[PDB]
Amino acid sequence: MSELEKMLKGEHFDGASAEIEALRSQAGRLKLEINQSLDEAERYALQRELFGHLGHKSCVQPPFHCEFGKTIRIGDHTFINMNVVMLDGAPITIGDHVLIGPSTQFYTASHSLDYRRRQAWETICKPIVIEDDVWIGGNVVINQGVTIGARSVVAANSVVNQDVPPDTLVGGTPARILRSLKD
Template sequence: MEALLEADEDLQHLMAGEWMRYRTSPALQELTWEAQSTCATINRIYYDDGVEARRLFHELVPGAGEGVDFRPPLSIDYGMRLVIGDRTFINADFLVIGGGSVVIGADCLIGPRCGIYTPNHALDIARRLEGWELPMPVVIGDNVWLGGSVTITPGVTIGDNSVIGAGSVVTKDIPANVIAVGNPCRPIRPVPES
């Protein structure tokens, strides 16, 4: 990784959270190809060799904590940019796209078909055609429950203990301890105490 980092300016920009160009970066393309290849292997062998699938997952996502449980298929672009807290459960069709850092807290429940998107492409035509994109971080607090088919857009933070209703599209920060739903997702009430 260090040799790639020294040789590729766009990889340096990715790691710094700066504008970069995936489409012109051999290093970024190689990293995502390797990550997607590992995901394909995990998805293929999960039920026949669960021990090896979990080993490959932790190799792909070195920031995954103890007791992280997942179900295939999963698709992750940059495992080294993903941190998952202890005891988090990730259901089928988990998708993390782009190179922005993603931090998922401990004890989270990630429903099926959830997607986390971290790249923002340039809005102006010329820069978009040149392939410029800005990776933005996503942070999900501890004990968050994402219902099925939740979409989280670049730069969003979801506070501890919150619940995001199925099918929601989270485009802005969600505070802690709320139930939030919709497109765009918005808080509708506090999470019950007990």
């Protein structure tokens, strides 16, 4: 098993592995051009090379930050605001009609509580999934292995450690259910 594939699969891996490093450069180069670009069509085009998928009529405002990019998939009519950071060692999958606030963070990557197990920067990545019609506010942290339920809202500055059921407003750190949005 490739170190790359180990990373995507939530197992231990070497980050200096070559195919991974290359992915990382591809990503570095693209961020810089996208981020320094004033042509809207030019940014979208380069994002189709940066991202795993970028859907129709979706927008991702610069500056946008990520580590690998190809792991990220964005559906249709989806909008991501400025200054978003995604640690994308594992797949990040984003639905349709999703809104994401500024300075929001997606961290697939994580570490062990035991310092003896972090001395080689050992990391595990688990995927994040944002379902359709979700609204994530600004300055939010969504941690690894979380799924956000459809038609749900995450309040500004929340930290989401666990799944968010659908049709729901949640808030805080860690996030809690504030109200049901179901009819």
